[PDB]
Design a protein around this nucleic acid. Structure first.
Length: 112
RNA sequence: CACUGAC
RNA sequence: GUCAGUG
């Protein structure tokens, strides 16, 4: 289980990935409202950003909001500040990446 | 440098 | 070998 559940957001401009509070959590129809919280992490030459649920992936040890370079925090209103052990990360041998989809009305920064 | 996946 | 993810 070595990979994001989702395809990358690709940075085509000089602006880093960032989202307004409440936005940025990729849609997962097998997930519940408690689960809608995690971080994007930086991996053509275009930098790629990958989403990982809180308490999972490279920065599984980071609590929400903890500042680190190349790490962006997102949460949908009503999400619980708990590790998403039951979702975890993706085995690429067993599972294809979910196409990263954000809902109507989501602000994407320039170059995404 | 190493491990894994796809081709 | 190539591309990609991770350490």
């Amino acid at each position: 289980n070595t990979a994001s559940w989702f395809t990358a957001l690709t940075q085509h401009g000089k602006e880093d990935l960032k989202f307004p509070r409440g936005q940025g959590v990729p849609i997962n129809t097998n997930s519940s409202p408690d689960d809608q919280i995690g971080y994007y992490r930086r991996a053509d030459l275009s930098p790629r950003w990958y989403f990982y649920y809180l308490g999972t992936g490279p920065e599984a040890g980071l609590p929400y909001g903890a500042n680190k370079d190349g790490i962006i925090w997102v949460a949908t209103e009503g999400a619980l500040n708990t590790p998403k052990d039951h979702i975890g990360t993706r085995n690429p041998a067993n599972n294809a990446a979910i196409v990263l989809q954000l809902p109507q009305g989501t602000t994407l920064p320039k170059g995404f």
